[PDB]
Amino acid sequence: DRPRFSFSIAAREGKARTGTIEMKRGVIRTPAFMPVGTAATVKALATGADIILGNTYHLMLRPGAERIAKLGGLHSFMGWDRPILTDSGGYQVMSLSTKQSEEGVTFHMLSPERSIEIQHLLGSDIVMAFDECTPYPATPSRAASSMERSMRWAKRSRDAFDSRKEQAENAALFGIQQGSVFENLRQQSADALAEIGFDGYAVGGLAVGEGQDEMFRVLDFSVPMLPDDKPHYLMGVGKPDDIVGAVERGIDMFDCVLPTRSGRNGQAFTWDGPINIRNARFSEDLKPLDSECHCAVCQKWSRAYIHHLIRAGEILGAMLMTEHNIAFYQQLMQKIRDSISEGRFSQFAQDFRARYFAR
Amino acid sequence: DRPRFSFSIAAREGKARTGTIEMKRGVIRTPAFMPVGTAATVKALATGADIILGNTYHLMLRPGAERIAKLGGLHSFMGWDRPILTDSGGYQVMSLSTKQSEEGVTFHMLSPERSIEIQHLLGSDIVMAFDECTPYPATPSRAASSMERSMRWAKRSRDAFDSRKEQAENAALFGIQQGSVFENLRQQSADALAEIGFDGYAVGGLAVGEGQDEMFRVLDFSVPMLPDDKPHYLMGVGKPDDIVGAVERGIDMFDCVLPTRSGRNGQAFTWDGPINIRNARFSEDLKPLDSECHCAVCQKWSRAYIHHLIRAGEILGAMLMTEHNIAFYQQLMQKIRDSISEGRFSQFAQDFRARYFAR
Ligand SMILES: Cc1ccc(CCc2c3nc[nH]c3cc3c(=O)[nH]c(N)nc23)cc1
Numbered sequence: 248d249r250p251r252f253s254f255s256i257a258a259r260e261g262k263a264r265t266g267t268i269e270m271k272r273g274v275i276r277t278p279a280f281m282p283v284g285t286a287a288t289v290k291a292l293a294t295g296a297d298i299i300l301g302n303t304y305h306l307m308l309r310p311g312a313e314r315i316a317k318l319g320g321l322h323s324f325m326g327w328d329r330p331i332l333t334d335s336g337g338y339q340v341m342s343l344s345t346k347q348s349e350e351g352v353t354f355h356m357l358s359p360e361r362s363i364e365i366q367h368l369l370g371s372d373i374v375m376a377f378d379e380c381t382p383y384p385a386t387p388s389r390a391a392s393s394m395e396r397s398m399r400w401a402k403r404s405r406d407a408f409d410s411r412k413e414q415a416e417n418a419a420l421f422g423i424q425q426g427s428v429f430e431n432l433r434q435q436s437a438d439a440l441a442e443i444g445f446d447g448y449a450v451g452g453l454a455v456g457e458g459q460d461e462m463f464r465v466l467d468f469s470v471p472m473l474p475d476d477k478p479h480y481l482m483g484v485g486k487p488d489d490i491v492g493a494v495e496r497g498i499d500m501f502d503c504v505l506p507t508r509s510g511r512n513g514q515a516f517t518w519d520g521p522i523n524i525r526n527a528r529f530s531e532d533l534k535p536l537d538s539e540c541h542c543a544v545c546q547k548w549s550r551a552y553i554h555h556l557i558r559a560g561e562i563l564g565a566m567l568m569t570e571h572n573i574a575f576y577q578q579l580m581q582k583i584r585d586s587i588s589e590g591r592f593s594q595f596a597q598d599f600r601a602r603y604f605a606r
Numbered sequence: 607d608r609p610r611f612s613f614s615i616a617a618r619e620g621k622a623r624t625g626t627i628e629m630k631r632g633v634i635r636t637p638a639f640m641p642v643g644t645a646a647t648v649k650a651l652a653t654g655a656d657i658i659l660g661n662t663y664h665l666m667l668r669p670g671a672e673r674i675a676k677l678g679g680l681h682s683f684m685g686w687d688r689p690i691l692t693d694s695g696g697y698q699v700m701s702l703s704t705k706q707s708e709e710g711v712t713f714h715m716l717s718p719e720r721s722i723e724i725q726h727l728l729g730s731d732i733v734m735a736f737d738e739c740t741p742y743p744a745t746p747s748r749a750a751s752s753m754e755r756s757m758r759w760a761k762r763s764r765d766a767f768d769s770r771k772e773q774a775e776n777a778a779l780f781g782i783q784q785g786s787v788f789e790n791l792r793q794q795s796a797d798a799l800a801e802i803g804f805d806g807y808a809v810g811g812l813a814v815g816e817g818q819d820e821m822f823r824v825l826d827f828s829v830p831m832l833p834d835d836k837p838h839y840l841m842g843v844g845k846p847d848d849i850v851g852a853v854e855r856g857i858d859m860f861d862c863v864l865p866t867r868s869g870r871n872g873q874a875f876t877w878d879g880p881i882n883i884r885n886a887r888f889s890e891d892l893k894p895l896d897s898e899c900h901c902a903v904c905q906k907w908s909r910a911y912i913h914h915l916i917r918a919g920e921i922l923g924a925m926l927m928t929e930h931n932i933a934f935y936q937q938l939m940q941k942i943r944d945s946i947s948e949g950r951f952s953q954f955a956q957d958f959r960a961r962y963f964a965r
């Protein structure tokens with residue numbers, strides 16, 4: 248059948264690439280948007296996807312990784328038979344929960360070994376190494392010390408993953424680059440990860456308050472340090488314009504939680520920029536959320552009706568907004584893939600920004 | 607094409623009837639459950655219906671009946687091309703908002719004439735007369751005075767409806783019986799409504815705290831006072847067992863808001879009674895919400911997953927619960943219609959109660 252893990256690049260334009268990841272549970276077209284699976288009914292890729300996210304930090308607390316395993320794993324639990332990616336829980340413990348040491352983080356304990364076992368019990372297909380997302384801003388010394396611990400933890404994550412036969416033979420493991428905003432530390436981190444060897448490489452430690460200009464600056468030198476022949480996952484990013492610029496700099500995978508969060512608060516993404524549907528200017532607007540969007544919501548209902556539902560406190564309004572936002576991001580990713588494949592991505596990015604920041 | 611309004615009875619068992627209402631926008635199979643249209647995406651009848659409810663009291667306040675008319679009416683607004691029923695707003699003004707007089711109710715003014723015009727602007731197909739839902743309990747004198755005012759208002763509602771050509775020719779008007787729990791006042795009210803003449807007759811003034819035994823007692827003598835050859839709508843009812851007992855007493859139409867409210871609070875309806883999915887006993891339950899339910903939710907997801915979603919605060923959990931509850935009520939109505947048509951409704955009601963109140 249399909250291999251455990253293959254990445255093939257079908258077309259390139261500058262630093263941008265488009266291709267496919269093959270795994271046992273399915274194919275992932277890249278650049279890929281990976282939505283959380285619990286925010287709406289995600290279908291096989293529209294309000295769908297090739298791969299969804301599990302929420303390791305939440306699941307290890309409710310109902311617990313052992314219970315998820317008892318219930319058949321996340322694929323059975325969520326009714327999703329395609330690939331699933333889980334984070335290692337390190338970022339979320341530090342953001343939401345903490346006592347740190349070389350062994351791991353107490354808050355329950357979380358270590359590289361326990362993080363890998365938790366992701367094993369959940370049954371995810373893409374497993375993230377257990378890292379430390381360095382806070383921003385950070386001094387060079389603090390960023391270096393943090394990156395060095397993350398690299399020791401990456402080696403421990405590799406070894407823990409390899410010691411579980413079912414996981415080593417059926418899942419894939421991604422290493423996470425750290426180093427804050429410092430080119431020399433980003434290089435040393437990429438070097439360390441490449442020596443250990445991973446199936447994919449994530450750019451960690453961004454989307455931590457640095458702003459888009461700084462994030463793009465860091466991606467300019469950081470992504471080329473990663474192995475070219477493996478997928479590149481930018482964690483925590485982001486807005487549609489973040490995605491286009493990150494693809495321009497060689498990123499292949501994205502996890503944006505914004506579209507599934509924005510929907511509950513009334514924010515809809517459109518080709519003309521985001522709008523807040525609760526605003527009174529939409530109370531009589533008979534256009535769909537976006538006039539070109541092909542999602543089920545825009546095929547049927549107006550801005551005026553979704554405005555009404557959300558203002559009325561109807562959960563239906565938020566669900567429709569969420570379904571539209573997920574669909575818009577997937578339509579964005581499809582246009583990105585098509586334009587790279589056709590050698591017109593540079594023009595697309597230009598056209599996208601001009602319209603997105605016009606209105 | 608179809609007539610403005612026809613009701614045909616296809617089969618009877620005791621006082622129970624099953625049949626069809628024909629209107630210009632579609633056919634309604636009876637006994638019918640009429641869900642609110644804003645609680646989930648309701649499809650053509652499953653998580654669907656032959657007719658949905660509009661919320662007159664909410665709509666006249668946000669965005670206003672004139673604005674709904676400017677947007678094309680509720681059918682265009684909600685994307686629903688089949689029949690729509692609206693209440694007259696009298697109950698809701700008194701429950702949720704008040705100064706009453708023979709002219710109407712100030713809170714905005716609401717009169718029989720204004721209520722009919724509001725329902726005209728909304729474009730509903732079944733229009734309710736403007737009544738006063740008598741509070742419970744009520745003395746005979748207070749119940750009589752209230753019923754008598756409602757009957758004068760029913761005549762004013764009839765005249766207002768008939769004076770709007772588009773409405774008189776394309777919609778239907780239902781009169782509402784009052785009289786609290788008093789047989790002689792229920793009779794006088796039915797007499798008054800029959801002399802005015804309506805397309806259907808509602809039993810009003812119940813589901814106001816009287817309890818199921820008292821409600822059934824009042825239906826025992828009240829429903830036979832209404833014209834047999836016209837549909838009978840019990841307003842505000844109710845639980846599944848309320849519906850079965852009310853069909854046994856000659857009711858044809860129901861509006862239950864409970865299934866669309868219960869879903870948000872974790873209550874699911876099953877053939878074994880209601881359950882609260884948030885209860886810890888469902889955290890590892892791999893069965894669907896109901897093992898016989900044919901809805902999309904029970905085809906795909908477990909109690910354990912819906913429990914997880916709701917406990918996690920995910921709006922998806924409440925939406926799935928709502929979709930299941932709407933579907934369960936429609937499956938209930940289908941079994942009621944089939945069993946009356948097959949002459950086995952008495953046995954069905956017996957079997958239903960024995961299982962529903964067992965667990
Ligand atoms: C469900 C879910 C969605 C997204 C994430 C990714 C969370 C996330 C970041 N989010 C913003 N910036 C981020 C940086 C890192 C990082 O450096 N390391 C890890 N392990 N995760 C990150 C985790 C869980």
Ligand SMILES: Cc1ccc(CCc2c3nc[nH]c3cc3c(=O)[nH]c(N)nc23)cc1
Pocket residue numbers: 642659660661662693694695696697698734737738739740782809810811812813814841842843861863
């Ligand atoms: C959206 C919506 C749903 C349901 C209703 C029906 C509201 C309702 C009653 N609810 C409980 N008991 C009820 C009695 C009456 C009544 O006597 N008169 C009217 N006009 N409505 C009633 C109105 C609006």
Ligand SMILES: [Zn+2]
Pocket residue numbers: 536537540541542543544545546571572574575
């Ligand atoms: Zn859309």
Ligand SMILES: [Zn+2]
Pocket residue numbers: 895896899900901902903904905930931933934
């Ligand atoms: Zn169901």
